[PDB]
Design an enzyme around this catalytic site. Sequence first.
Site, mmCIF file in Angstrom:
data_model
loop_
_atom_site.group_PDB
_atom_site.id
_atom_site.type_symbol
_atom_site.label_atom_id
_atom_site.label_comp_id
_atom_site.label_asym_id
_atom_site.label_seq_id
_atom_site.Cartn_x
_atom_site.Cartn_y
_atom_site.Cartn_z
ATOM 1 N N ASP A 1 -1.258 5.520 -5.527
ATOM 2 C CA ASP A 1 -1.721 4.642 -4.452
ATOM 3 C C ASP A 1 -2.058 3.243 -4.946
ATOM 4 O O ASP A 1 -3.132 3.044 -5.490
ATOM 5 C CB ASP A 1 -2.960 5.286 -3.747
ATOM 6 C CG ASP A 1 -3.541 4.464 -2.603
ATOM 7 O OD1 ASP A 1 -2.881 3.507 -2.162
ATOM 8 O OD2 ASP A 1 -4.646 4.780 -2.153
ATOM 9 N N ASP B 1 0.777 -1.229 0.000
ATOM 10 C CA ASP B 1 0.000 0.000 0.000
ATOM 11 C C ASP B 1 0.807 1.276 0.000
ATOM 12 O O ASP B 1 1.194 1.752 1.065
ATOM 13 C CB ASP B 1 -0.966 -0.033 1.216
ATOM 14 C CG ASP B 1 -2.020 1.048 1.230
ATOM 15 O OD1 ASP B 1 -2.147 1.780 0.205
ATOM 16 O OD2 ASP B 1 -2.706 1.189 2.267
#
EC number: 3.4.23.46
Length: 387
Positions: A232, A36
């Site tokens: 992201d 992440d």
Amino acid sequence: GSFVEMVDNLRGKSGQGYYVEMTVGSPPQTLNILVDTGSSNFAVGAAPHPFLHRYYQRQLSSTYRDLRKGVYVPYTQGKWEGELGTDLVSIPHGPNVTVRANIAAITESDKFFINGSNWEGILGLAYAEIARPDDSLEPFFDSLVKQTHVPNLFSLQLCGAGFPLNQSEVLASVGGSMIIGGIDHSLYTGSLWYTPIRREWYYEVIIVRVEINGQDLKMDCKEYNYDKSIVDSGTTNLRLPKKVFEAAVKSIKAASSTEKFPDGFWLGEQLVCWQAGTTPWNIFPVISLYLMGEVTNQSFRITILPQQYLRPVEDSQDDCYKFAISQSSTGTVMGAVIMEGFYVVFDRARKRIGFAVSACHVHDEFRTAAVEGPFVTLDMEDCGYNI
Ligand SMILES: CN1C(=N)N[C@](CCC2CCCCC2)(C[C@H]2CCC[C@@H](Nc3ccc4ccccc4n3)C2)C1=O
């Protein structure tokens, strides 16, 4: 140059996430951990949960250290709550090092874990500024760099299959690579082009121009980065600020107007299906995002295909997709569906992010994703949003 030990160390897909194997504790406890770049906590399932078949057992680790501090992390879709501590952490298909890192042992969550994803925790790869409860909780990557000689850089190659993967195929398939401490040249073609990291919190970048099949969206560039633009891997879609999303969808509808799609398709809620092999890729436009360059008044562009922004989903023998572009009220998010077109270099040491055409991007015989430059672009610093 070449990091064979780390090539092909990811598994997963855009909608459920891309994960890497890690070990925590003594003796080592093997866990699958989602990569992440949109958060900064190493947070792992530490209590039974219906979607987990394993979790971190603090009581079984002789190197576990209890920080005697809780952490509460609400986000848009849900929340995760836990207990902070430290333990020895390794990446079996990573550098050959063991680090003492912070771990948030997840004891409660809502809309965090994903049924059938095969991961039990997340690896927050962004900066300390967005670590929870606050910036004193050192992120994993910072510990890794501080405790070893690993260069302050990592690179991601997320490989979308281009078709649905069932439960057994997604477990057996190679999902991509996370190269820790370097750049592997077999993962990309052409040149790497770098955009500055605007600020070290999220991996924040500045978009200076947007095109749909070469047609300029023609909005004030501040709109593209209102209130920020981030890279992201923990978000599925290309997410766009409300006004940009509305202009982009209008332009995407106009370019693909030879076929009419229901409103629910454009809302990313409903699938669209074509007879096997007949997806009309050619009617959908390419999208180009120009990013601020490292040279003054210079930009470069990354171009994605509908093979990236149409997300394959199983229905039948039909080829079905969801529209993987959606609206945001928290700025632009270049999610996994955009990252799937490129090899992305998070060069923390030089405060820049590199893009190159991925050796594993999905394309057709007529078009390919591209990373091209330079382009003369003025007042790029003005494209950044403030307050
Ligand atoms: C964008 N995004 C991200 N990149 N990381 C988080 C945290 C952001 C940080 C930012 C700094 C401040 C604290 C919060 C967490 C997600 C990780 C990926 C799996 C997802 N899990 C989900 C998401 C939605 C779901 C919806 C339904 C069911 C399960 C779900 N599971 C949750 C997030 O919201």
